[PDB]
Design a protein around this ligand. Structure first.
Ligand SMILES: N[C@@H](CCC(=O)N[C@@H](CS)C(=O)NCC(=O)O)C(=O)O
Lengths: 241, 60
C-alpha cells in the first residue's frame, strides 16, 4: 500500500498473509468463514519453477499484524487443503481474477481473527464511495514492503472513466478504486487482499480483491480490483458460505 | 536465448503479487533480487540465485 498508514491491531481481523515455501509473503487473502478464504487467482498459478497451484506449498497467517512477529499471541498459522481458481481466469488479461482457499483446519474466531461479510449478488458499490485497502505490499512501486499491515482509504471510480483511463484492459469483472490524483494505491504484495467497505449497519463487507495496476499510485492510473457481488453464487456453490 | 534470458531488464509487471525473484544484471555481472508481480514476466526471472548464476554467468 502506497500512501497508507499503520493499521490498528485488531482493525482488519479478516486480513490474511499467504507465504509460499522458501519465499515468504506473496499475497493477501480474506477470511470469509472458519474454513475458507478469498484471494486472487494469479497468485496460484504453476510456472516453470514452482507449483503455486499446489496447496501444500503455502501457509496462511491469520491474526497477523507485523510480519516480523509471526508468533505474537493471537496469530494463527494454517496450511491449505485446497485452492480453487475461477474456471474462467485468464492469466494474460487478468479477467476473472479470484480464487477460493480452503484451510487445512478451521480458524478460531477471536479479537484478532474474524471473517469479513460478503455482499449479496445484486449489491452495487457506488461510484465515489470511500473504501479501504489493506496489506503488507510495497510502499512505492519497485520499492520495499511494510512489516506492519498498512491501510489506505480510496474511492470507487466510475467504470466508464476506468475503461477510458486504461483502454482495452478493463472487463466487467473489474473495478477501478483509488484516486485520479494518485498518491494512495495498493501495490506488489497486496494482491488477493480485500477491499473493505463500511455498510449500512456499520459492518464491513468485502468490495473486491486486489488484482493489478499500471505501476502504483500514479495519476489517472488507479488500482484495478476483482468485483465481489457477481461471484457471490460461485462462492456459495463452492464453499456453502 | 541470451538476449532474453540474461540481457533483458527485470520486469515487475502489472499484477500485485510479491514474488521474490532474481535477475541477471550484465552491467554488474551478478544476479540481483527483485520482486515480480506474478503476471506477464520476461525470461530474466529466476526462482533462485543459483539458477540465475548457472544461466547467465559471464554474459556481457
Ligand atoms: N462470527 C460470527 C458472526 C459474526 C461476524 O463476525 N460476522 C462477520 C461476517 S458477516 C462480520 O460482521 N464481519 C464484519 C465486521 O466485523 O464489521 C459467527 O460465528 O457466526
Amino acid at each position: 500500500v502506497v500512501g497508507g498508514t499503520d493499521a490498528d491491531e485488531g482493525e482488519w481481523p479478516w486480513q490474511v498473509s499467504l507465504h509460499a515455501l522458501g519465499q515468504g509473503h506473496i499475497c493477501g487473502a480474506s477470511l470469509i468463514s472458519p474454513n475458507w478464504l478469498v484471494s486472487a487467482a494469479h497468485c496460484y498459478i504453476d510456472d516453470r519453477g514452482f507449483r503455486y497451484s499446489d496447496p501444500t506449498q503455502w501457509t496462511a497467517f491469520l491474526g497477523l499484524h507485523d510480519q516480523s512477529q509471526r508468533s505474537a499471541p493471537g496469530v494463527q498459522e494454517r496450511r491449505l487443503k485446497r485452492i480453487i481458481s475461477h474456471p474462467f481466469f485468464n492469466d494474460f488479461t487478468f479477467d476473472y481474477d479470484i480464487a477460493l482457499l480452503e484451510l487445512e483446519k478451521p480458524a478460531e474466531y477471536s479479537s484478532m481473527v474474524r471473517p469479513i461479510c460478503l455482499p449479496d449478488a445484486s449489491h452495487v458499490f457506488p461510484a465515489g464511495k470511500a473504501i479501504w485497502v489493506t496489506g503488507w505490499g510495497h510502499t512505492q512501486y519497485g520499492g520495499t514492503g511494510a512489516l506492519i499491515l498498512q491501510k489506505g482509504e480510496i474511492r470507487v471510480i466510475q467504470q466508464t472513466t476506468c475503461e477510458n483511463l486504461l483502454p482495452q484492459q478493463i472487463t466487467p469483472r473489474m473495478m477501478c478504486v483509488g484516486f485520479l490524483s494518485g498518491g494512495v494505491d495498493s501495490c506488489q504484495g497486496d494482491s488477493g487482499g480485500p477491499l473493505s467497505s463500511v455498510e449500512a449497519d456499520g459492518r464491513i463487507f468485502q468490495a473486491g480483491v486486489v488484482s493489478w495496476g499500471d505501476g502504483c499510485a500514479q495519476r489517472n492510473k488507479p488500482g484495478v480490483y476483482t468485483r465481489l457481488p457477481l461471484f457471490r453464487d460461485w462462492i456459495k456453490e463452492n464453499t456453502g458460505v | 536465448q541470451t538476449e532474453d534470458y540474461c540481457l533483458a531488464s527485470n520486469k515487475v509487471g502489472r499484477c500485485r503479487g510479491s514474488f521474490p525473484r532474481w535477475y541477471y544484471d550484465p552491467t554488474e555481472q551478478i544476479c540481483k533480487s527483485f520482486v515480480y508481480g506474478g503476471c506477464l514476466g520476461n525470461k530474466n526471472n529466476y526462482l533462485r540465485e543459483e539458477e540465475c548464476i548457472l544461466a547467465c554467468r559471464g554474459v556481457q
